[PDB]
Each structure stands twice: as structure tokens, then as C-alpha cells.
Amino acid sequence: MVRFLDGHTPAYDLTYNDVFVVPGRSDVASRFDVDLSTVDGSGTTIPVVVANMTAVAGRRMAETVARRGGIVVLPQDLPITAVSETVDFVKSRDLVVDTPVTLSPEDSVSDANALLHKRAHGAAVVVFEGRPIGLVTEANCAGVDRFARVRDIALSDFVTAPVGTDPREVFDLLEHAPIDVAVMTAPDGTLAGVLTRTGAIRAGIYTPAVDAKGRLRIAAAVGINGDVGAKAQALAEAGADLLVIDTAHGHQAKMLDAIKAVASLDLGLPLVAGNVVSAEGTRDLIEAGASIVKVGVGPGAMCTTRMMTGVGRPQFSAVVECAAAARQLGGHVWADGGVRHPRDVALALAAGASNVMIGSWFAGTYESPGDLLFDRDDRPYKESYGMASKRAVASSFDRARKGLFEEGISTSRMSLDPARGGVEDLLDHITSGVRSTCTYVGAANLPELHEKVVLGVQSAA
Amino acid sequence: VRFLDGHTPAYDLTYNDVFVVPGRSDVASRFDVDLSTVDGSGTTIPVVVANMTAVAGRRMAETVARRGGIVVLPQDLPITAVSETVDFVKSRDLVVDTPVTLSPEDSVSDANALLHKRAHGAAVVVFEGRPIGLVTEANCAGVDRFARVRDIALSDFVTAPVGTDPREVFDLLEHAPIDVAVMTAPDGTLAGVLTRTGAIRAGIYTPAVDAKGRLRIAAAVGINGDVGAKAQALAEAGADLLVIDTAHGHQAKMLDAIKAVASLDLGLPLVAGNVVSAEGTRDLIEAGASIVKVGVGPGAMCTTRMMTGVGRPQFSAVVECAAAARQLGGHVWADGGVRHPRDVALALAAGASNVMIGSWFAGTYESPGDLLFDRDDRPYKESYGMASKRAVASSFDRARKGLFEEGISTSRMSLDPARGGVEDLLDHITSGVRSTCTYVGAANLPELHEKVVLGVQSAA
Amino acid sequence: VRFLDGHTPAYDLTYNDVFVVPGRSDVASRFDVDLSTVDGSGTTIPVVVANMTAVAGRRMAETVARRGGIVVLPQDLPITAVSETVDFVKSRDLVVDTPVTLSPEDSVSDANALLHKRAHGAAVVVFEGRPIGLVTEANCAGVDRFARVRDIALSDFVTAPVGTDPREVFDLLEHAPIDVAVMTAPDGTLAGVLTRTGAIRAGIYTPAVDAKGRLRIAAAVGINGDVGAKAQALAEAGADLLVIDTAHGHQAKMLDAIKAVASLDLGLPLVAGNVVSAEGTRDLIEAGASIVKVGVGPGAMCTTRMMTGVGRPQFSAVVECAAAARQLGGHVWADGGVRHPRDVALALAAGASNVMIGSWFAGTYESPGDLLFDRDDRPYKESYGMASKRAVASSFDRARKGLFEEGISTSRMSLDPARGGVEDLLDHITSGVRSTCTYVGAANLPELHEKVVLGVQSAA
């Protein structure tokens, strides 16, 4: 339960910008003595959930984040065949070794240059008949005819190791390698994946989020139109480890009905529903059958929902109120929206959320589905965009009529960090910060963070 | 500390949030104010230079101590470098400054680069330890940059025996083309320089000195490793004050470190930090600190706050911690976020006994970094943080732990084209604080904290 | 030279006015061309570095001579520095290069600055003459700039004994993370470094060497004072070639100086300049010069032309003077305005035996000036003129003569973010000139001038 400094009782509600954490007496010396695992049934080992947005939640993101202990929620209305293919891909991945970009010897240098940035490894693996035969780097593509063949620029010499080799050993094998990529082989010699020095280190820091079969975790979202029960059962059968019942205004009869319909199917999976920003909405969603309530409605005062409707709530106050209500009912809260810095993750957790959902921030990474773009200053970025009517309740004349008022798709430019270009660099950034918040507070884990935290309010100074 | 009636905000206060209400005053002159501190640091003005490699070099330590401040050498400075730095500072004259020196065989290019390590506007050419000429920036212009210093140096300059009264040196320089007097030892060797402004400052600032009359200096130590052994070595090297420094001072490892150092009975004032709470202040004092350094993420948009959400608005932090320390007979240093003389005055009004300044003083001639110039040819220097040297701590194992460590962030600190030296900043700071006391009716720093009335203002 | 029929313009020609027409060629490969010169300079490529303090330092002299050029030390360099420079250059290895070296106790800040004095991308850390590590620019990033080199140096690096076949060293570096081989003397002390590109260049460029197999170097003298005594001392210090240099070469004081030096019978090639006319070329050769340096105000907008109206378009100047020198068995150096490989090729087509290059080579790592960065953070260095060191020459009287002296003009020469080393410029120049020869059908430089057909183009 949060405590505020004496007298810090503002006549207004609080954003992540309004509050600070006061250090407390601590005997948690090292960041690594903190346990970042969550307690809400999601199965995450770090408190990061990737938002059910097409701009962010693709198969590369789902593999990469779950390996480091987060979970990705697939966007609602992804066709069920594509759900199954995505789940099968993620759940066939190695828990340590990553999936590289692969090239044919007959690919063009131009196509190789474009594909390289789909992963953060800095190299693609040339394969012939399933066997790795070389590496292609960005440097190998410079100053050559963009329609030359990959065969003519690929490097035949690279570090290789059998899949299952200790990450400690792979790390040392790469110490004096020119290219910081080890090509991992299956017993027959075919490609099993890659491991970089930083990937080797991360294996010893992050615990993979895994299902009961030991395969990487993945979640899936459903909107509240149509046959919500049938959609949810299909997602469960496709292999989702967690269902998110998602709508813009969660505190409404159609959402309550949808939760009861999914809960009555007894699918055996944690059920998230949202979004609300009130204790009353939180209670009603839990009593309908959800165990996790997703919290966040127009948290940004200048963002589209607030400027169209006036409707929203400052997110820190929303999470504090909803998490306390959920805690009294045996449930949990996900803080959804507005996260742009590790501070926001730490404050949402201090406020009592069990997990933090991140959307547009993660669009600005190699692993998000969108294409890598470059602005006027040649700086890298990717476009985030909203789910719009896929989060809303719903003749050719009649089609245009209902379509006239629906929300447009807003687009934002999310710059890639030249130093944190991969999502795993953001995860290092986020969890380094949260681990530090825990040491300042005196907390050895996330329950203790929320139990011990002291907060204050600051002015616009 | 007294606020205007009703000024009880539902939030904590930064330096930007508050103002001092003038009071009835009989303190007419700025110079009637006593700026000396009462915390055992020995400073005669309330300025301490932060233990940061970007700021706390030997030129800074000499220059600030002569004007009554003290410089804290950065933690993990190797002990031989500590001894060499202390021996340099403690061999400096109390009035006469150390100039840039040049060999006749140095190049004009090197002379030009070295001139800006001090604020004197002239380097002294020396031969066999004795002054033979002056080099100015104007002497370097329009000359082949690989010409020798001997071919641009001025052989005519004001000289006087070291020990000459600063008033008389001031007058000797009144009609000199170059505002630099070259001071000599009895054997003719260079003893230092004195400018007309340096001579005036000798009459305004009392040097901060040890019991032997030598310039004061302090040294910091982090809480990893053998803190007692490190502190004992710093004491034997001659530090006048020890600073036990860590990002999160309110933790067991810091309490243990204070007790270990205190048990060695080194005979020096012990500073420990950083905290921002009354409880943290009490705990550091009870472990053995006499002075508590206060400041944790005071800037809402700076790295610590944006990484962790952790911190506290610095005026409120200093108010609460100073009051806690004073009940126990201790003191607090206000550490962080100082950018204007107002911040120094407000820290003291809040009850701090001393104010620690870091990045602001990086933008001076005397800081250790190189003088740089931006797109508009304006001078600046980079300040950067101490990072993991303030944090608690196989090649795989090393890279594992190194992954999460705080990176070194850098900021550009512009030099004032009129306050380019740190002593100009000290003039600016102490002129302002003296005026704050005259407005409050205070004749010294205890009276400033006792008599001040403060108010809160809006974002207007 | 032959010009296309009717190409007889009513004006003189710059390097921008002319083009070379391809001829029937059986010179297939650029590597079949012999770029060695025939003027007694001993260069194996037609490049001479100008006698300018902005360019002609010891690192440049070593680096260019190893690739077959020669550097002319600036006039009025003190004879003790001449001797030190000559001794440095003539003790260099003909294949292995001199690296930047560092002490383990140097700062990261100093290491970063020194790295750019060579093009190797790495400095060698030395303790007691022995190499113990390599420092790269990447090693310096993200660490405290006052950390010690010891804490960032890489202890793993490729090493081979001096005398190892360059082709073997090239192979040894194929999978090395750092493209630098540390070459050792028999006792294991540092002898130098070799990179993969340095290994390749050893198979392309023949070092310019004296009869004892040591790298060649030249030295310049102005025409004031005791020219014969100065020339004698330069020869005694070991210069392989002397340059008698003045702004207006066609004058009595220059003729006297050439005769004075010629009469000493020093046994060295003797360059004198500068002139732009057939009459001046004949007079300098008759006075005793073997090589005439050609070039006076070749740029219509540069300082000499804008101050006096005096000069001559350089391509016409070279054509006229080279033809005149050939009638007397002499040679011509094309001095001034070279900015592209085209200019070198056109100078040689015009009949020059060698091409002297100044400010272009200031924008390299190996030039003596410091590496600078412009408003866009792009690397550059400043070239500047020798000014009154090329001119004929009470403190009142000194100021009277000084009032009219030429000021030093300064210009920014940007480094190529790739071709930052002077050897990269030599690759650019000699690749171009070799191509010119293949287009002309010439197997060597005399054939280039004998076979070339030129044309004139308009301003379009």
C-alpha cells in the first residue's frame, strides 16, 4: 500500500510526471538481489507486457520479449490461422539461442541490407540447404553493386558452436572474433540460431517466460464484438497462454457480458479485461470473472481520446485506485498506457500494478513489425499507430454511415536509439531502472516495492 | 524555517518554488556579513566543490581554497595522485597564484592551448626556474603556430618580491600594459603571479587553511572495498576532511562504512551521503558522521529521476535534513542542482551549513577538462557524472555486472566570456549571498537561517 | 605538348581549362606504368610535399618518403631541428611504420588526442620499450576521460617479428579484430606497426631512399642571410635535395644565391624558384639550378593575385617553363594549386618532372597541425602560408618594415572521413595518374609528356 509524505494531498489527480519516490532504509545492495518476477498468473519474470497493437506485437517481438521474461499480447482480430502460425513459431524457439535473419546466396545485396535490421544481431546468416555457409554484415554491403549476389560479399569464416553449449563458453569463444555473432548448429550441422556476447550475458540475467511445457509464453487479445466466447476458445485452442479482453471503455454492460461468456467456458487461462480507471470499474470487471484488470483511459491530456471527448484519468492516480480495489478482491492490475521511460514502469509498480503494458515505445525497435525509416536528419525511426476501431464497440450505405464517425488511425514517429536499437536494450534500460528503484526503497521484490514505497508530489518547477 | 502564513503547499519544493521576503535590516554593507561556516569544514565561504573528476582537479583545489572554499578530490583517485595533489595544494602561496608556465622552446601552438588553464590572461616564460617573459593570447595571433615562444614573448613585465603587500602590487600594476605581476623568490625563481583583481580578492576572501597555515583540501571515498583502509590512507596523505560518498546513502553498507572509518579515530570531520530524509540523516549521524550530504535526484528530468522515479525536490530535502541534523548537533551539505547564486542562498536559508557545487564549475578555466567551442564559437567544457564510482558493487562475470551499470552522461557547461574563471563565479555567488543576508537582516550564516522568512510562488 | 587543331586560345590556361584526349594504347594495366621521376630527386612517384610548416613535419616526411615521394622541410627550421628530423626519418623502417605510443599512465583523454597523429586506428601501449597492448578510439568511449590507459588497453593483439613477409602479416591479420600488427625487434621491443593496407602498399610503392638505403628527405632555404652557409649546413645534416625558395624567383638576389650554393659543389640536386616564364627558367638554370620550381599567383582569387595582379595560369606556366628547361637539360616542378589527381596528371602532361603539393596535404592525420572539427563536427585542419619566410628582407625600424609584410593566410582543409591519411591521398593521386597514362598509351612519365594530346574547353 502506498504512503505519501505528510501533507502531500493535492486537489487533483496525478500523472507519472507529478510524483517522486523517497529513498528508504535499505539492505538490498545489488540490483541483482532483486526478484522482478510477477505474481499475477501472467508468468512473466520481468514486469513488462507488450501491448496488443499491430504496430508492435508481431512474431519477432513475441519471441524476443518472452525469451527475456516478458510476454507479448497478439492484437485482436489477427486471423486465427495467423494466430496459430505465430504461436507455433514462438513456441518452437530456443530458450537461449535467437533466430537470425537468414539469406540465400542468390539474394541481392540490396535485399540483404534491408532484411538485416529485422533483428539486432548486426549480421545475417547465409544458408544453403539449411546449413550455415557465411555471415553478411552491413559493412559487407557497402561500396558494392546493390544488385550483386550475397554469395560475393558473404564471409565464410565465423564462430560456430553446437546448440546447447553453455552461454559462458560461447561468450568466451567470441572474445576475439571480428564479428560478435556465434552460429549455433543442430546435431546434423544445420542452423539452430545465433548467440551474441550480449545475448549470452542476458541468458544469465533474464529468466525466460515459459508455459507448463517449457516453451516461450504468448498471449492473445479479443475485442468484445461478435462471438466473444467462440473467439476466446479458438485462441485458447491455438495455444495462447493468457487472454486479454480489450475495449476502449471497459466499464460497460457489453464488456461485463463478454467476461462472463469467456469465464463460463472454463478455458483454464488467466483472463485480463479492460480498460477502466476507477475502483468501481475494477470491481465490476473482477466480479464478472476477470482476474487481471487493465487500467488506462486517455491518460495523456493532449492525446486523441482526451482531445476528442474530455474523457480520461491521470494514470498514476488511476493505477493507485484500481490496484488497491483489485487487491481487496484477490485480483491484479496492469498499468496500460503512457510509458516512455523506466521511471514510468517503476512508478506503475510502486502504485500497485502487477505488470506494465508498453505499446508505442517498443515500436521504435528493430524487432517491431514495421519498416525501419529515416527522418530528415537521417535518424532511424518507426511509426507507431493505434488500433482505433479494433478497440471500439460496433448495405454499402450502412457501411459508410457507421464508418463516418469511427476513430481515425493516428500515427506517431518513435525514434530508435542509436545505442538501444533492439527491444532487449530497452528491457535492460527498463529493468536496470526498476531494480534500482527497488534498492532505493529497500525492496527485494515487487510486492515489497509496493508495500514499502514512500511517495511525494512535486510542482511544475 | 519560517514561511509566510498559509504557504503550506501539498507538494515538496525545489529552488525554483520559493523566495525570500525582505526583513527589517541593520546590516548596511555586504562586507559586514561573515560568510564563514560552522560545520568544521574550515571554509570561510559556503562553497564546496563536488568530488567529480570533471571539476575537482589540482588547479581547482588551489584556486577555490585560496578564496575560502574547499575542493573534495574524487573517490578512487589513486593514492599516489592524492598525495601529489595534496602536496601541490599545500605548497601554494596564500595570496600569489600559480600561473601557466612555458619554456622558450615551446611552440606558439602549445602556448595558445595552455593559456586557458588559468584566468590570468598571460603565461610566464621560465628558464632555470626564473621568469624571463610573458606570453599573451594577442602575442600568439598572426604568428606561425610552430614559431618558438622565445620569438613572441614580452621581456618587459611588472615584477615584485613574493611577500610584497597586495595593495602595493595593485598600485605597481595601475599603468602596466599587462595586468599581471610576476612574483619572485629571494633566489630569483618564480613564486607565482598576482593580478589587480587577485590583489583585491586577497582583501575580500580569507583563505581556507589547516592548522599549519596551508590551503585546505578534502578527499572522497566510496563504500566498496576496504573503506577503513582507504580512509586511513587519505588521512595520512593529508586530507583535511573525508567524504564517504554513495548514491543511496541510507543503506546498511554505508552505515557499516561510517562506523568502520569512525572507529579508526582519524581526527578528521566525516561527511557521509547522500540522503534526503530525516531518518536517513539521523542514521548517518548515529553511525558516526558529523556532516550529512543531502541530495538524491533533485532534478525532475535528470538521469536518476528518469531511470527510477527516485529523488526529492532539493529545498524540501535540505529543510527536513538540516532540521534533523541540528537536533543531533550535526550539519548538512546541500549537494546538487546549484546553477545560480540564488540556489546557494536558498540552501543556506533552508539550514545547510555548506553548499556543494559540481557541474556549474566545470565551465571554468580552472576545471580539468579541455576548453571547447560550440557551433557559434562560444567556449564551453563538458561536465560528466561519476556514474558507477558512486554505486555499490571472470570476464563473463564482469560483463554481466557491467551491463546494468549507469552510463556516463555528459552536459555542456558554457563559460561566461566575463566570468570565465571560477573566482568570477565565486564573486557572483558570494556577492549574491551577502546581498541575501543584507535583505534578511543577517550578519552571518546562522542568523540567515534563524531570521529568514520564505514564501512559495506559482509557475507564473 | 600537342594541342588539338585550332585550340590556340587568346589566353593562358589553368588546370580547369584543359583536357587530355585518349590515344591508342597498349598499356593495359595501371601497374605496368612506371611512375618514377627522372629529375634526380629520387622520388618513385611524382609527388613532392611543399616546404610549409603546415604540412612538412617529421611524420609527413617519414610517411610520404616510404611511399616514394619526398618532403621538403620548411626554410628557417633551426638546424638542430633539421638534424633531429633527418635522423628520425633516416632511421625509419622501409616497410613497418612508426605508431603512436602510450604509457599505461597516460590518460584516456591524452590517448584519444594522440591517436589521430597516425592513420593506424590504434596506439601501442609500451612499458620499457616493449609493446603490451593496443588502444583504439572504441576503447576510449564511455569511460572517464581521466581514467588511465592501463584500464582500457587491449592485451591481445597480432604480433610478428620485423622482416616477416608483408604477405604473411597481411594473412595473420585477416581475422584479427584490430587491423594492426605489432612488429618487434629481435629482443622483443617495439619496432613499429604494419596494417593490411600497409602490407599491400609495400607491394605497390617503392620507398624513396638514398644510396645507403635510408628514406629520402629534402630541405628548403630562403635567399636572405648567408645562403651558402645555410645550404652547407643542410647538406651536412643529411638532406638529399636542396630547395632555394622565394616568392619572386626571377631576381638578382636569387641568381646570386644559386651561384653561391652551386659554387660549394655539395653534390645534391638543386631546386630553385619560383618563376613562371621561359626567361626566368633559363636564368635560374644558367645560375646553377638543376630543377626550376614553377608557380606564382596561380589562383586568380588568391592573396598574391588580389594584392598585386601578378601571377600566371599554372598550366600555361608549366608548359612554357618545362619546354625552356628541356633546352638546357633541366627539369621543372609544378608548385601550387593542386587539389585533385587531375591536376597532378595535367602538370606531368605539361612537362613537369614532379608536382609539389601543399595545402591539400594539410588535411591529413600526418600533417603537424592539430585535428579540428567544424560546425558540422566534420574533421579538418588549417593550412596557412609561409608568408614572409618566402620574401626578401631599432624596434622602430623593425615595426616600419613589418607594417607592409604579408600576413599569414589561413584556410580550412577538410579530412576525408575515409581517405584521412596522406597515403590514402597518394593512392588517389597515383591511381589517377596511372589511369591517365593508360588512356594516353604511356608506360612512364617521359612517354606521358611525349604522347599526350590536349584540348581546350569553355566555361560550360
Ligand SMILES: Nc1ncnc2c1ncn2[C@@H]1O[C@H](COP(=O)(O)OP(=O)(O)OP(=O)(O)O)[C@@H](O)[C@H]1O
Ligand atoms: N493475416 C493477417 N491479417 C492481419 N494482420 C496480420 C495478418 N498476419 C499478420 N498480421 C499482422 O502483421 C504484423 C506482422 O506480423 P508477423 O510479424 O507475424 O508477420 P511476418 O511477415 O511473419 O513478419 P516479418 O516482418 O518478421 O517477416 C502484425 O501486426 C500482425 O498482427
Ligand SMILES: Nc1ncnc2c1ncn2[C@@H]1O[C@H](COP(=O)(O)OP(=O)(O)OP(=O)(O)O)[C@@H](O)[C@H]1O
Ligand atoms: N592517476 C589518475 N587516475 C585517475 N584519475 C586521475 C589520475 N590523476 C589525476 N586524475 C584525475 O584527472 C583530473 C585532472 O587531475 P589533475 O588536475 O591533478 O591533473 P594534472 O594533469 O596534473 O593537471 P593539469 O590539468 O593542470 O595539467 C582529475 O579528475 C583527477 O581526479
Ligand SMILES: Nc1ncnc2c1ncn2[C@@H]1O[C@H](COP(=O)(O)OP(=O)(O)OP(=O)(O)O)[C@@H](O)[C@H]1O
Ligand atoms: N624549433 C623549431 N622552430 C620552428 N619551427 C619548428 C621547430 N621545430 C619544429 N618546427 C616546426 O613545427 C612543425 C612540426 O615539426 P615536427 O613534426 O618536427 O614536430 P614534433 O613535435 O616532432 O611533431 P609531432 O609530435 O606532432 O609528431 C613543423 O612545421 C616544423 O617545421
Ligand SMILES: O=c1[nH]cnc2c1ncn2[C@@H]1O[C@H](COP(=O)(O)O)[C@@H](O)[C@H]1O
Ligand atoms: O487507436 C488507439 N487510440 C487510443 N488508445 C489506443 C489506441 N490503440 C491502442 N490504444 C491504447 O494505448 C495503449 C498503448 O499506449 P502507449 O504505450 O502509450 O503507446 C494500448 O495498450 C491501448 O490501451
Ligand SMILES: O=c1[nH]cnc2c1ncn2[C@@H]1O[C@H](COP(=O)(O)O)[C@@H](O)[C@H]1O
Ligand atoms: O553520474 C552521476 N549521476 C548522478 N548523480 C551524480 C553523478 N555524479 C555526481 N552526481 C551527484 O551530482 C552532484 C553534483 O551536482 P551538480 O552540481 O548539479 O552537477 C554530485 O556532488 C553528486 O552528488
Ligand SMILES: O=c1[nH]cnc2c1ncn2[C@@H]1O[C@H](COP(=O)(O)O)[C@@H](O)[C@H]1O
Ligand atoms: O604565404 C604564402 N603566400 C603565397 N604563396 C605561398 C605561401 N606559402 C607558400 N606558398 C606557395 O604555395 C605553394 C603551395 O600551394 P598549395 O599546394 O596550393 O597550397 C607553396 O609550395 C609555395 O609555392
